[PDB]
Write a protein that binds this ligand. Structure first.
Ligand SMILES: CCN(CC)CC(=O)Nc1c(C)cccc1C
Lengths: 582, 582
């Protein structure tokens, strides 16, 4: 924007309140390993500095460009820098240089605990004793575990967080009033983080060319009743925003986000009739809703494509002279008239249409060349549906657990070279899709699935990326985006895998297993199974799905055995030695 | 002791703040998981109750005992109990059954992150704004991370903690007065907590005859002015105490520790000269100190053994008739006039005398069979002095890191069959001894080493025991105790080893190494070297140390390299390739 003290420009538009946090995030998303006090200090130190910039724009450094004032204030530590012998010490670099050498250090999976909750009465207690130190830490614990969270969205949560307390902290059993709403939050937040990560990942990995086509797709379905170039307008608007939330430019990311809120609430009419009640609520609750709203009704008369995109004999006339924007119409039109279609599906189609025009505009009699181009669509607009059908029908039989086990093997046979902890975190999550998609009607089961799946396949690629072990994966991950899911399902087994070296400390379990949560114990069964298949890949399931039964009946035998931490080494000795038979 | 409302009978020996702390300890040592806010609450809930026991001796349940009233307030965690999902239903069992079924499985090795201290700028800030909380949080952290750790000592560290704060929170540079004293604190209690564990370990795994003979020794050193009947007595007193704190009875063991302190400070005149002062601090600090004081100046006169034990005509007289306490009479005599000897050396000596008297009282002409027994001592009193002498030179030539490497290679060839993650853990620590020992003078290095060592050897048996892979390592671990160091220092290489199959997926490294910490980046190089050796055992410390350099200079060339993870890919492949040379 046009301003000298760039700091203050945003400071105003966002407000002292939406600063101390939009800045707490920044530090949290950067230094993650660093404690609470360290971050509140630095924020309550960039606040004073940012207060003098509210005075005279030409003070100390007020003229600077945030990134500068940021990284600098970050090297105010150089203390815990011992935990960073290399990396995060590169403040020697200038601009951009070091700011890049910062967005890189962000750990996608930090070595942290789950946040254990104090009992419900102790939470409300701390909520009163200091209603602000409380809400701050929540905003922080999350932002350090999710370095790529939609920074502004993360604000809205702390709002629903405060409210969740301000209401639920008064009733005979306020306890059971609160949690069922914190959990909605816990998850619903964890879900947003995963979607956003994908958006950022599609920017830093496939430029914005790819990104836009996504918005053109999900912004059409959402606001179908709105001009093509009015959407192509919001699409480009939204892009700049998300580019700056991924780039770490939080303040301006929110500043731009709100700027859109205002705007779309102005052109509320030439956009849809669902923004109504959402504009009448805080600029905070504003942005959020607007994007996660309901789709609007289709157009009355519909040109039903065809003549508009396949029949018009002089196709290339508007193609070789347009390409982009022209294909953008095709998308806008197609997507807007398919609130049932998955976003990834519309793109496979559009990239299919593009694969046709570029092949037909190079042959005699082109206007009759394609024609049967929509003939390609059929298997592709069905294949996904037939897949969701299968795996859902299967999910409703094996149940979430045993199902995650099916994948644990299939996906672990396909690429054993992959980190064991990942194969679990991922496979478990793939199983989690069936739970929150096979509850939907056939029409809406299409997106939810292909979408949630897209998300999870990414947190596979973002994990493997830091530690590349199977170039087969990196092949599926780097080679195209709207070809990721198709790629993996296509992967076959691996005869070139040398069965992992035994290691008994692995298949050795202890009474520690007994004192575990139902899930963190399942996750142990999971991890066990993975390291297992990796040990002798060419093994059938009826055998695994037997050795596993044995183990389950074992862990459940030495958790009920009179007083046994002794049999985990006696019966466990037998189990290992026994299973090796077959 | 004795009293009606023991709940308030204790509130009169410590009286709040010394009571609000002992409660935060006992609790945070059981509910190691439940957060801080929960623990503070649970401490007040006992205070306000123990206050209504100051109101009138007989009220609600003031008459109740402690193990009982603690369990009651313990079955208050009706909330948090998912990690206790199959832990703590023993509230059904009554006294004493209920107490046991609690101790039996409270984590002995929690899964908590390493405290990342804030900036010293804010630690002091916090130390002022809220001195009370900031201080009691440390107690909860340290007490939870050390469940079986003594409670009194814990309190001591706490006052020295604030002492380091009240004193150092104002200086041109407080960041130089502070953490040198805090790092000092960490590894001290860490040593005390570990040296504590070993104590119980030996007591439980090897009866108490082996334990008494241990205290007899290090007591005779601490207090050489004391008679024997005095020392002998103190031992049985101390043996009762230590058998308790170990078993878990921390409520009475703590009492007895305070009971004993009275008797040692009662008659210092027939015990030690160094007592005087410490017997002036409150009853709490009068225990922790007395045990860890200093070695009283040797007597003004000494009959220089020999005549007592070597001749006596029939030493088999007051021996074959009294056996123990005779060797104890001896150990006392010997250990009192050898303060600088390690307490483990003195014990090998006393076992060498017994084994001798047993082989000389079995052949006609005893006083001529032995009388030449103090000869076998000559070597075994120098033999250790030899191994500490060498290694110290070596240490002060390679430094910690490179010294550990030489060990990772040595001990690894000795027992390749061991868990890599283990060999590193143990080898590193061995290299960590020389640091906090090779600084001390010549006299205070025989025990310093042999002490700090048997702890590191112990935390090898606890690791190996969990996963027995080499019968000649559990051998050394079980076979005797004072034959641990002698057994391991004996282990030859291993011509019978099957070189761990290649697999270079462990020999591949990725950018993440750079964004690691000083130690944890070296932990990987050492994890590497171990895995290296286990691939072609019969190499040479010439080639190993050689290739260890190429790699070290490689990870350096690849972290600063432009900005590449492709570096590690292309370069690492060149490293593996060239490493295959030799
Ligand atoms: C059963 C529905 N949810 C919450 C009510 C389960 C869940 O969220 N599990 C989960 C969490 C919370 C964080 C990291 C990894 C996992 C597998």
């Amino acid at each position: 924007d046009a301003h000298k003290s760039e700091v203050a420009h945003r400071f105003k538009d966002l407000g002292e309140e939406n600063f101390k946090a939009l800045v707490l995030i920044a530090f949290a998303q950067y230094l993650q390993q660093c404690p609470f006090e360290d971050h509140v200090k630095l924020v309550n130190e960039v606040t004073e500095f940012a207060k003098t910039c509210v005075a005279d724009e030409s003070a100390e450094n007020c003229d600077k460009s945030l990134h500068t004032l940021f990284g600098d204030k970050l090297c105010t530590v150089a203390t815990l820098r011992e935990t960073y012998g290399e990396m995060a010490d590169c403040c020697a670099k200038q601009e951009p240089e070091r700011n890049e050498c910062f967005l890189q250090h962000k750990d996608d999976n930090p070595n942290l605990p789950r946040l254990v909750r104090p009992e419900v009465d102790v939470m409300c207690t701390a909520f009163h004793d200091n209603e602000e130190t409380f809400l701050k830490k929540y905003l922080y614990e999350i932002a350090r575990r999710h370095p790529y969270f939609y920074a502004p969205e993360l604000l809205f949560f702390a709002k629903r967080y405060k409210a969740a307390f301000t209401e639920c902290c008064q009733a005979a059993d306020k306890a059971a009033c609160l949690l069922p709403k914190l959990d909605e939050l816990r998850d619903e937040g964890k879900a947003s983080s995963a979607k956003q990560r994908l958006k950022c990942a599609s920017l830093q990995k496939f430029g914005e060319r790819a990104f836009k086509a996504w918005a053109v797709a999900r912004l059409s379905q959402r606001f179908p009743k709105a001009e093509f170039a009015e959407v192509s307008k919001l699409v480009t608007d939204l892009t700049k925003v998300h580019t700056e939330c991924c780039h770490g430019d939080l303040l301006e990311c929110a500043d731009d986000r709100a700027d859109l809120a205002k705007y779309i609430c102005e052109n509320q009419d030439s956009i849809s009739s669902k923004l109504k009640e959402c504009c009448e609520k805080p600029l905070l609750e504003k942005s959020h809703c607007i994007a996660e709203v309901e789709n609007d009704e289709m157009p009355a008369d519909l040109p039903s494509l065809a003549a508009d995109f396949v029949e018009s004999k002089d196709v290339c006339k508007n193609y070789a002279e347009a390409k982009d924007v022209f294909l953008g119409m095709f998308l806008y039109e197609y997507a807007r008239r398919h609130p049932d279609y998955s976003v990834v599906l519309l793109l496979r189609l559009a990239k299919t249409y593009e694969t046709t025009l570029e092949k037909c505009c190079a042959a005699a009699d082109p206007h009759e060349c394609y024609a049967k181009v929509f003939d390609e669509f059929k298997p592709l607009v069905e294949e996904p549906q037939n897949l969701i059908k299968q795996n859902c029908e299967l999910f409703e039989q094996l149940g979430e657990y045993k199902f995650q086990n099916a994948l644990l093997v299939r996906y672990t046979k396909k690429v054993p070279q992959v980190s064991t902890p990942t194969l679990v975190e991922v496979s478990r999550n793939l199983g989690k899709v069936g739970s929150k998609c096979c509850k939907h009607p056939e029409a809406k089961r299409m997106p939810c699935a292909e979408d949630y799946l897209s998300v999870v396949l990414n947190q596979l690629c973002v994990l493997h990326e830091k530690t590349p072990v199977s170039d087969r994966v990196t092949k599926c991950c780097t080679e195209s985006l709207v070809n990721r899911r198709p790629c993996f399902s296509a992967l076959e087994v691996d005869e070139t895998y040398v069965p992992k070296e035994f290691n008994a400390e692995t298949f050795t379990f202890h009474a520690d297993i007994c004192t575990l949560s139902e899930k963190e114990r399942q996750i142990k069964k999971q991890t066990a199974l993975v390291e297992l298949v990796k040990h002798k890949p060419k093994a059938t399931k009826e055998q695994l799905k037997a050795v596993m039964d044995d183990f389950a009946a074992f862990v459940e035998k030495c958790c009920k055995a009179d007083d046994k931490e002794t049999c985990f080494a006696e019966e466990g000795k037998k189990l290992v030695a026994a299973s090796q038979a077959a």
